[PDB]
A paper describes a structure:
pmcThe CCAAT/enhancer-binding protein (C/EBP) transcription factors belong to the basic region-leucine zipper (bZIP) family of transcription factors, which play crucial roles in tissue development, cell proliferation, and differentiation. In humans, ten C/EBP transcription factors have been identified, including six C/EBP proteins (named C/EBPα-ζ), and four C/EBP-related proteins, TEF, HLF, DBP, and NFIL3 (8, 9, 10, 11). The bZIP domain consists of a basic region (BR) and a leucine zipper region with a sequence of heptad repeats. The leucine zipper region is responsible for the dimerization of the bZIP domain, allowing the bZIP proteins to form either homodimers or heterodimers.
Our ITC results showed that C/EBPα and C/EBPβ bound to the TTACGTAA DNA with a Kd of ∼0.354 μM and 0.018 μM, respectively, which were 1.4- or 3.8-fold stronger than to the TTGCGCAA DNA, i.e., the reported consensus binding sequence of C/EBPα/β. To understand why C/EBPα/β prefers recognizing the TTACGTAA DNA, we determined the structures of C/EBPα and C/EBPβ in complex with the TTACGTAA DNA, respectively. Our ITC results showed that the binding affinity of NFIL3 to the TTACGTAA DNA was ∼ 2-fold weaker than that of C/EBPβ. Sequence analysis of the DNA binding basic region showed that the A87 in NFIL3 was substituted by V285 in C/EBPβ. By comparing the structures of the NFIL3-TTACGTAA complex and the C/EBPβ-TTACGTAA complex, we found that the longer side chain of V285 in C/EBPβ could form extra van der Waals interactions and an O•••H-C hydrogen bond with T4 on the T4/A4' base pair compared to A87 of NFIL3. The longer side chain of V285 could also form van der Waals interactions with R289 to attract the latter to form bidentate hydrogen bonds with G6' in the C6/G6' base pair. Structural comparison showed that the shorter side chain of D320 in C/EBPα prevented it from forming additional hydrogen bonds with N321' in the other monomer, unlike E111 in NFIL3 or E309 in C/EBPβ that formed a hydrogen bond with N112' in NFIL3 or N321' in C/EBPβ from the other monomer. On the other hand, mutating E111 of NFIL3 or E309 of C/EBPβ to D resulted in ∼8- or 4-fold weaker binding affinities than their wild-type counterparts, respectively.
Author numbering:
A (entry chain A): 268 to 335
B (entry chain B): 268 to 333
DNA sequence: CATTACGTAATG
DNA sequence: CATTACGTAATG
């Protein structure tokens, strides 16, 4: 059964499919890791934008009250 | 090599460690995908603030050219 | 073919 | 002990 040629071919093909499936799983993990870095960078960009608008706004609010 | 008590025990212990190591890997992967969902949720939060501030600013500039 | 539990062995 | 390449077998 294990010395039959059909078992040997069967194992050859599955071994190839296993390697391929494990390597695609790696890549999906790397992509998810890449996503964390993209969200983090865009997150940093967005809070700095919020901080700019917050400043521009708060600056104005304080000078408006600055004149009865 | 095998059939020895030495080898049977060594395998029992490695098998336990493998299972542990694979379960811990599952969880770090789980954690990483938890992180994308929080960065995504926090992203949407920050976008909506930028938009609210942008609106508040923009209405101001427009009303000033009267 | 693709996926995954389970195991072996080499290795840090 | 923990990690990982490599393989087997059951299964979708």
């Amino acid at each position: 059964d294990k010395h039959s040629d059909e078992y040997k071919i069967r194992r050859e093909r599955n071994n190839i499919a296993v390697r391929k499936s494990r390597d695609k799983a790696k890549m999906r993990n790397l992509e998810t890791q890449h996503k964390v870095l993209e969200l983090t960078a865009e997150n940093e960009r967005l809070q700095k934008k919020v901080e700019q608008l917050s400043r521009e706004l708060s600056t104005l609010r304080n000078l408006f009250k600055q004149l009865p």
